[PDB]
From TrEMBL, chain A:
UniProt pathway: Aromatic compound metabolism; 4-hydroxyphenylacetate degradation; pyruvate and succinate semialdehyde from 4-hydroxyphenylacetate: step 1/7
Organism: Escherichia coli
HpaB/PvcC/4-BUDH C-terminal domain sequence ranges: 288-489
Any one GO MF annotation of this record: flavin adenine dinucleotide binding
Catalytic activity of the protein: 4-hydroxyphenylacetate + FADH2 + O2 = 3,4-dihydroxyphenylacetate + FAD + H2O + H(+)
Residues annotated as binding FAD: 155-157, 196
EC number: 1.14.14.9
Name of the protein in question: 4-hydroxyphenylacetate 3-monooxygenase, oxygenase component
Record has Flavoprotein as a keyword: yes
Root EC class: oxidoreductase
Length: 520, 518, 518
């Protein structure tokens, strides 16, 4: 039973109901010391699963289908989310940018690992399948499959944060490695860092870590895909903000934690058989080193991430204004100036996504890639912008983020509520129910455990502070951008020497230099 | 004589030679306690004048006309710099963006007040002349004049930094005001804060301590020639003259040719003819001009591109400087340079968005994306201060381990030690190493570098003001209401009793609080 | 002739006049492609020399001797600056802190390499002479000599910024190395990075691209007179000369008297007598000197006080500058000035802690709190860059709305407009307003201001190195192990089954997970 066989039609991706049915499979997930029986009904995952299911439902609704979907390029006569099909122009990238924005708005920018994130991987396979050599047909088939079905992939690429001071092949007891080569496929074992929302995915792409030196053993030089229900695949979940908010809070108290929690799970592979049809790069140091620059994925996914963050910043910006209307401090110059800077950061990420599309270039086989410099720029700025925005919220909303009753239960008890109505009202006529609601929404965005995890995510998810900057420099150098900037500096330098100007339009200083007269 | 009458043709802007001749007028400029006889030959201005003259020469080069010029829209059959005529599409704005970049590369991004900066004012007059009421014909004529000739305007808008704690009605002894209304025109007196490069301009636009007040004699906008009686400039110290008198082009390569003197602008009982008046004793038009005039919604396109060109230069110069010292091999150094690259990329991406998201305005004119203009203004001071700190903390002693002068290289007694001990890393010779690092020092640490940091931090407004204007744009455009509609939708999806949407599970079956607090 | 033989008495340090006479020796200095005949009269050095001479004169003033001087500990019956003799208590360090502050106030915190900076080296030699083995007597003699005379030392320790990607063994064509061992002493050649104010010093201590390597010919520490054959300086541009040639004291008040020329130090086959050798072909002593020598554990007391004095000056000057513009009335401006006040307070509080937490070392000597020294080094670059940004973003156009020269005030034709339009706020006259703002600009934006920013950011090491050394101090002192004992205690108070301490309640009675996940 293929997960896409739950669809009532082969000419469209899953509906939300078919997607939920596709998750009631053999996946082996652990949380709070027990195996999850059904991820769609379990109290740690049911609402995050329902939230992803809503994205699938939106693909078929007349109210969103046109902004979200295109026909497939496969000859099936079907349709798919625009970002699941290879772009072949700058306008195609702009349409994909808008389709990503529309889906992201459904979670207010809070779900960062929705199916469109890894759809860029499906497109990378379809745009350049020749890169994979003997595995070219697997790349072509995987592109067709992902595009037609809307299959939900995530990736587990970063190695566990253990023995970082050593090359990947020197942490053999932990990192993903080839165990055995057989006729049916390859046996792999090891673990990857947290695989965000992988409990709700169909497949994971398992790839080599690029920020850590690989070494000299080719058994670590692998790229392949694994279904979430493959025997030996195990997820060990982190604490569930969804379950905690359900057990000890309410949607009113924790409105984001209760529906958008993407569990960052440890991914374990215990002697998993990967069929040859799922192998993409095999014991190949050459292809592993070339994949970041030639594969296309690294040159596609930040378009999705930049738009998703820009949507979250649309939400945070207006929510900060709403929060300041609660306290009444929005009337002050300093407060307005701080909110104005949040507006500037919000505007920045939308402008970067515009440039990604307008400056797009042809690649291979007619495929277009977004502006690579803009992708690297989003990665560098986002951690700085996010940390600054959170600090601005805390230093302006101040006590408004803590002057809040424990629970919706307090509002529902008239003995407590009578005091909340009088003493916890909003400024200028706003009732206490709305005031507490707005400020709890802001606190869940930045200070709840979910808010704290989101700050950790925005700071680190695409790489360390040094790595994102190194990659930004490498792009400038590899593209020829640095050589073009250097040609301008070399022109400036060529216009004079130790004797004076070499250009005839400027005046030498022989008639005005006073040093001989002063020193000789 | 009109400055444009120096042109041998009415079908093109000035050549560099005609531009220089046009500055040899009756202008009253002071520097170092003396009157400046001729800005084109004076040692404080001659090279900055020659640098601007090069921009005019570039307009007439066949290899550069495709990027720099377009036909006029006046019916003269002439041509002009692309940014001197009203944009009528997103593509027109992109071509203007490129024409600004091409001119800016001629000064490596260091001249921030070149003729294209105020060409946006000429275009604002041409795009919306109806805004000016009875002065509509002046707006139309000034647009035609600026466009055809390439007339060099600057503006003096910011009031002197005196009694900022008071409104623009309680400091009448200093600020620009109407003093007499006559048949020939208006008599004005007062001063404006530094008018950058105004010593080399043909005209200055004079426009309205933030809060204006209640006296309409201060509610003015008009044009003044640089050679009108009573118009005078009191110059600041000349980095060009100092670099010439005590340095050399090798030692101070930017100071020696790109210094834009920030002069105090004084108007002493100046007669402004009615043909030069645009807004007269009109608080309503003065308050509406920032949002309806167009200029405030056009010039940051020029300034963002000009900065992005300077960042192309600084980025590669930082790489060159780190190649000198050999520290470019280290991870931390590469990461810091990578961040400079990210800031450089940002300002180009903002200029892209300004053009692609452009909107129709009035009479077929297009305006760049307003949010992107406000974003450039907010980010630029932070990016510039951060980039300078990154250079200083990475190039470190390389910026000071330099001989005093090109005279040290030209003395073999000293040069023998420079050749051995002040060589560049991995085979680079000492002449090139010292040259690169002196170029970087002139960009950030010389008095010229220091002034450029003060300029990038402040020129479009105080830190609070640029942020306030960014917020106002979000509110006035409807952007804030659209972001708010998303927050209100999120809020509408639940209440104190649970979800109001049917796809989510209520917590009644899992909430343990009742069972826990008996 | 010995430089101290210029003194009319052996029982006190130099007077200013004797100090100036002592500099009129055979020193080989270059600037602007020419040999400097006499540093005391040359226009690039005369005022900086006069400024140092004033510090020596202050030692002999009865009104200042209580704060500045103590008896020598040598048995000579003489006196010296307090920081020139070994501290033997926390109170001795506090009195030295005050004596440093008093001398620093004479240059308003702008001279960072005055004779008291290297007096810490003289004290390090006197406190632990046994460290130097066979060179112990040289350490004792040098301590006595520096203490009694007030000899002016600087140090040249940092290698030229060339081939930083290589160790101090693979750049032999540049770095200081032993070339010959003889009966009279050692022959050395090489260069060091800028030796701040070395043109005005008597001697330089020469000491060991970070990683040293494996060749012991580079493992040296020794003293060299400024007039030894082969010792020479190649000066950087002179802010003093430039301010004199093209400015005035009114226009550049700090550049004109406190410029400490950052000179390239060259040693060409210099003979160093054995009496001047301290560490010889000894990797063991070179590696142990940073932790056992004492100097690295003494000089940041001088530097922290000197910066705190400069911050007293900058803080009040920022208030004065904001009184000029009138913006001091606004909340945001007052808040920014308040932060400058907080940074100024910090460096004084660090100097307090350096003294009160002082510890015994060897032979009765006391050392300031090592953690506070490392903290000053880490915070100072961040505080300085932030303070400069605060000044620029608040004083804004006040720093550029200034006439070129005192010559503008002395020309009534220009001065009439300065009096009206460049007056200060609320009654302050234009002469005082321009004077205050030019003083602030010379502090931060002139080439001297730019060099001072580069100095404060980098002089004690790169951003990573100062932080690494701060961490190493925490580890080596046992501070980190004591902080770790608290974290280990916290961890020991529970395990995977619950609390291990009896005062806390386990969650068995309230944990709902079993009941929820059936
Ligand atoms: C909430 C969250 C969700 C995530 N989801 C996913 C996911 O779905 N899939 C996935 O594959 N990954 C995921 N990640 C991992 C993420 O991509 C990484 O955290 C990021 O790439 C940084 O790598 P790292 O954690 O190994 O940090 P490191 O690379 O180990 O950096 C830590 C520190 O060590 C330094 N350092 C490390 N190596 C070196 C070196 N060789 N030389 C010098 N300094 C070095 C760094 O500069 C930094 O200061 C997620 C992370 C978070 C926080
Ligand atoms: C090198 C340089 C070149 C320039 N060239 C030109 C030019 O050619 N033409 C031109 O017209 N201008 C020019 N300017 C002026 C520039 O536009 C201004 O400096 C800028 O607009 C900031 O205004 P300001 O200097 O008056 O600072 P201010 O507005 O006075 O700000 C200083 C401080 O006071 C605070 N403040 C001021 N007013 C208030 C208030 N009402 N309420 C609360 N806080 C307040 C600010 O928040 C800030 O902290 C130039 C400036 C520089 C530095
Ligand atoms: C105005 C001024 C006056 C001075 N006066 C004196 C004086 O009188 N006497 C004196 O001896 N010195 C003096 N100095 C030198 C000063 O002490 C040094 O600049 C400081 O120690 C920093 O060392 P550096 O310049 O070699 O920088 P570097 O150490 O070369 O650092 C530059 C960059 O390279 C990186 N880097 C360097 N090496 C490594 C490495 N191995 N691994 C990783 N990254 C690395 C750093 O992290 C940094 O990002 C002065 C400096 C200045 C600016």
């Amino acid at each position: 039973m293929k997960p896409e066989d739950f669809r009532a039609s082969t000419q469209r991706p899953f509906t939300g109901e078919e997607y939920l049915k596709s998750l009631q499979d053999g996946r082996e997930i652990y949380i709070y010391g027990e195996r999850v029986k059904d991820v769609t009904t379990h109290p740690a995952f049911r609402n995050a699963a329902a939230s992803v299911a809503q994205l699938y439902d939106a693909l078929h609704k007349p109210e969103m289908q046109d902004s979200l979907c295109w026909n497939t390029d496969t000859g099936s006569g079907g349709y798919t989310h625009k970002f699941f099909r290879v772009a072949k122009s700058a306008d195609d990238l702009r349409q994909q940018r808008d389709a990503i924005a529309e889906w992201s708005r459904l979670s207010y920018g809070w779900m960062g690992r929705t199916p469109d994130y890894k759809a860029a991987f499906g497109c990378a396979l379809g745009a350049n399948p020749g890169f994979y050599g003997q595995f070219e047909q697997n790349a072509r088939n995987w592109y067709t499959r992902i595009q037609e079905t809307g299959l939900y992939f995530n990736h587990a690429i970063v190695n566990p944060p253990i023995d970082r001071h050593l090359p990947t092949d020197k942490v053999k007891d932990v990192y993903i490695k080839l165990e055995k080569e057989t006729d049916a496929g390859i046996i792999v074992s090891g673990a990857k860092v947290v695989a965000t929302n992988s409990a709700l995915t169909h497949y994971n792409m398992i790839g080599f870590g690029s920020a850590q030196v690989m070494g000299e053993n080719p058994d670590f030089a692998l790229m392949f895909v694994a279904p979430m229900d493959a025997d030996g695949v195990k997820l060990i979940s982190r604490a569930s903000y969804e379950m905690v908010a359900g057990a000890t809070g309410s949607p009113y108290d924790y409105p984001l934690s209760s529906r958008f929690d993407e569990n960052d799970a440890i991914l374990v592979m215990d002697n998993v058989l990967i069929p040859w049809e799922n192998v993409l790069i095999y014991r190949d140091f050459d292809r592993c080193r070339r994949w970041t620059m030639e594969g296309g994925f690294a040159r596609m996914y930040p378009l999705q991430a930049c738009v998703r963050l820009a949507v979250k910043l649309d939400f945070i910006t207006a929510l900060l204004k709403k929060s300041l209307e609660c306290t009444g401090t929005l009337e002050f110059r300093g407060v307005q100036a701080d909110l104005g800077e949040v507006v500037a950061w919000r505007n920045t990420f939308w402008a970067l996504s515009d440039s990604m599309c307008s400056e797009a270039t042809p690649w291979v086989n007619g495929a277009y890639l977004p502006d690579h410099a803009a992708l690297q720029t989003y990665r560098v700025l986002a951690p700085m912008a996010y940390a600054k925005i959170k600090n601005i919220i805390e230093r302006n909303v101040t006590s408004g983020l803590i002057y809040l009753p424990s629970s919706a239960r307090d509002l529902n008890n008239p003995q407590i509520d009578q005091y909340l109505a009088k003493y916890v009202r909003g400024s200028n006529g706003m009732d206490h129910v709305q005031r507490i609601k707005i400020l709890k929404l802001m606190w869940d965005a930045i200070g709840s455990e979910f808010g704290g995890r989101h700050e950790l995510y925005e700071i680190n998810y695409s790489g360390s502070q040094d790595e994102i900057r190194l990659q930004c420099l490498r792009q400038a150098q590899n593209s020829g951008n640095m050589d073009k900037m250097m040609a301008m500096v070399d022109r400036c330098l060529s216009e004079y020497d130790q004797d004076g100007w070499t250009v005839p339009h400027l005046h030498n200083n022989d008639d005005i230099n006073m040093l001989d007269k002063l020193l000789k």
